[PDB]
Amino acid sequence: FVNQHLCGSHLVEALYLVCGERGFFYTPKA
Amino acid sequence: GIVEQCCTSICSLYQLENYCN
């Protein structure tokens, strides 16, 4: 479900499902 | 950045996992 254009909340949502109990870091201004 | 790799262009599992801790 990740091989598509993921923007905004749609992206943050994917990182959450994928990273799991590891967590992740969202940086749009990188 | 992630937006330029997964938003303006198509995302991939390899890229997403780079942002997991």
mmCIF file with all atom_site columns, C-alpha atoms in Angstrom:
data_model
loop_
_atom_site.group_PDB
_atom_site.id
_atom_site.type_symbol
_atom_site.label_atom_id
_atom_site.label_alt_id
_atom_site.label_comp_id
_atom_site.label_asym_id
_atom_site.label_entity_id
_atom_site.label_seq_id
_atom_site.pdbx_PDB_ins_code
_atom_site.Cartn_x
_atom_site.Cartn_y
_atom_site.Cartn_z
_atom_site.occupancy
_atom_site.B_iso_or_equiv
_atom_site.pdbx_formal_charge
_atom_site.auth_seq_id
_atom_site.auth_comp_id
_atom_site.auth_asym_id
_atom_site.auth_atom_id
_atom_site.pdbx_PDB_model_num
ATOM 1  C CA . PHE A 1 1  ? 0.000  0.000  0.000  1.00 0.00 ? 1  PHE A CA 1
ATOM 2  C CA . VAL A 1 2  ? 3.097  2.244  0.027  1.00 0.00 ? 2  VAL A CA 1
ATOM 3  C CA . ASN A 1 3  ? 3.904  2.335  -3.695 1.00 0.00 ? 3  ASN A CA 1
ATOM 4  C CA . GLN A 1 4  ? 1.808  5.407  -4.392 1.00 0.00 ? 4  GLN A CA 1
ATOM 5  C CA . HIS A 1 5  ? 1.779  9.193  -3.898 1.00 0.00 ? 5  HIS A CA 1
ATOM 6  C CA . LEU A 1 6  ? 1.546  9.649  -0.086 1.00 0.00 ? 6  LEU A CA 1
ATOM 7  C CA . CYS A 1 7  ? 1.082  13.226 1.152  1.00 0.00 ? 7  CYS A CA 1
ATOM 8  C CA . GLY A 1 8  ? 0.324  14.881 4.470  1.00 0.00 ? 8  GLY A CA 1
ATOM 9  C CA . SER A 1 9  ? -1.658 12.738 6.909  1.00 0.00 ? 9  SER A CA 1
ATOM 10 C CA . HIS A 1 10 ? -1.670 9.955  4.303  1.00 0.00 ? 10 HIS A CA 1
ATOM 11 C CA . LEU A 1 11 ? 2.126  9.748  4.657  1.00 0.00 ? 11 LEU A CA 1
ATOM 12 C CA . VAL A 1 12 ? 2.248  9.988  8.445  1.00 0.00 ? 12 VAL A CA 1
ATOM 13 C CA . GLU A 1 13 ? -0.327 7.189  8.532  1.00 0.00 ? 13 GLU A CA 1
ATOM 14 C CA . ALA A 1 14 ? 1.856  4.903  6.370  1.00 0.00 ? 14 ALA A CA 1
ATOM 15 C CA . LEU A 1 15 ? 4.968  5.492  8.526  1.00 0.00 ? 15 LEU A CA 1
ATOM 16 C CA . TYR A 1 16 ? 2.861  4.484  11.534 1.00 0.00 ? 16 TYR A CA 1
ATOM 17 C CA . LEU A 1 17 ? 1.696  1.177  10.015 1.00 0.00 ? 17 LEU A CA 1
ATOM 18 C CA . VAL A 1 18 ? 5.128  0.311  8.625  1.00 0.00 ? 18 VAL A CA 1
ATOM 19 C CA . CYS A 1 19 ? 7.419  1.360  11.496 1.00 0.00 ? 19 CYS A CA 1
ATOM 20 C CA . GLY A 1 20 ? 5.178  -0.246 14.119 1.00 0.00 ? 20 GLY A CA 1
ATOM 21 C CA . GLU A 1 21 ? 6.471  -0.272 17.690 1.00 0.00 ? 21 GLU A CA 1
ATOM 22 C CA . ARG A 1 22 ? 9.768  1.186  16.523 1.00 0.00 ? 22 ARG A CA 1
ATOM 23 C CA . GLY A 1 23 ? 8.343  4.611  15.859 1.00 0.00 ? 23 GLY A CA 1
ATOM 24 C CA . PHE A 1 24 ? 9.452  7.060  13.155 1.00 0.00 ? 24 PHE A CA 1
ATOM 25 C CA . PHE A 1 25 ? 10.435 10.657 12.480 1.00 0.00 ? 25 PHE A CA 1
ATOM 26 C CA . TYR A 1 26 ? 8.470  12.925 10.145 1.00 0.00 ? 26 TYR A CA 1
ATOM 27 C CA . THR A 1 27 ? 10.460 15.823 8.693  1.00 0.00 ? 27 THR A CA 1
ATOM 28 C CA . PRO A 1 28 ? 8.742  17.618 5.780  1.00 0.00 ? 28 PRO A CA 1
ATOM 29 C CA . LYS A 1 29 ? 11.360 20.395 5.670  1.00 0.00 ? 29 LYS A CA 1
ATOM 30 C CA . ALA A 1 30 ? 14.376 18.082 5.210  1.00 0.00 ? 30 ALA A CA 1
ATOM 31 C CA . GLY B 2 1  ? 13.202 14.906 1.910  1.00 0.00 ? 1  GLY B CA 1
ATOM 32 C CA . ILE B 2 2  ? 10.463 12.335 2.457  1.00 0.00 ? 2  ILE B CA 1
ATOM 33 C CA . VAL B 2 3  ? 7.883  14.660 0.808  1.00 0.00 ? 3  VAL B CA 1
ATOM 34 C CA . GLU B 2 4  ? 9.992  14.865 -2.328 1.00 0.00 ? 4  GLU B CA 1
ATOM 35 C CA . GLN B 2 5  ? 10.424 11.064 -2.283 1.00 0.00 ? 5  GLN B CA 1
ATOM 36 C CA . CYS B 2 6  ? 6.977  9.858  -1.267 1.00 0.00 ? 6  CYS B CA 1
ATOM 37 C CA . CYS B 2 7  ? 4.617  12.736 -2.062 1.00 0.00 ? 7  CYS B CA 1
ATOM 38 C CA . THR B 2 8  ? 5.637  14.628 -5.216 1.00 0.00 ? 8  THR B CA 1
ATOM 39 C CA . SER B 2 9  ? 7.133  11.331 -6.506 1.00 0.00 ? 9  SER B CA 1
ATOM 40 C CA . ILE B 2 10 ? 6.047  7.716  -5.803 1.00 0.00 ? 10 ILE B CA 1
ATOM 41 C CA . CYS B 2 11 ? 7.043  6.180  -2.447 1.00 0.00 ? 11 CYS B CA 1
ATOM 42 C CA . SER B 2 12 ? 8.721  2.816  -1.812 1.00 0.00 ? 12 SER B CA 1
ATOM 43 C CA . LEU B 2 13 ? 9.110  0.588  1.285  1.00 0.00 ? 13 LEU B CA 1
ATOM 44 C CA . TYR B 2 14 ? 12.886 1.050  1.136  1.00 0.00 ? 14 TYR B CA 1
ATOM 45 C CA . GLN B 2 15 ? 12.397 4.820  1.633  1.00 0.00 ? 15 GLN B CA 1
ATOM 46 C CA . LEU B 2 16 ? 9.755  4.649  4.350  1.00 0.00 ? 16 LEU B CA 1
ATOM 47 C CA . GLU B 2 17 ? 11.797 2.321  6.557  1.00 0.00 ? 17 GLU B CA 1
ATOM 48 C CA . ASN B 2 18 ? 14.714 4.785  6.457  1.00 0.00 ? 18 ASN B CA 1
ATOM 49 C CA . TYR B 2 19 ? 12.511 7.053  8.614  1.00 0.00 ? 19 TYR B CA 1
ATOM 50 C CA . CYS B 2 20 ? 11.754 4.425  11.280 1.00 0.00 ? 20 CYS B CA 1
ATOM 51 C CA . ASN B 2 21 ? 13.840 4.634  14.489 1.00 0.00 ? 21 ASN B CA 1
#
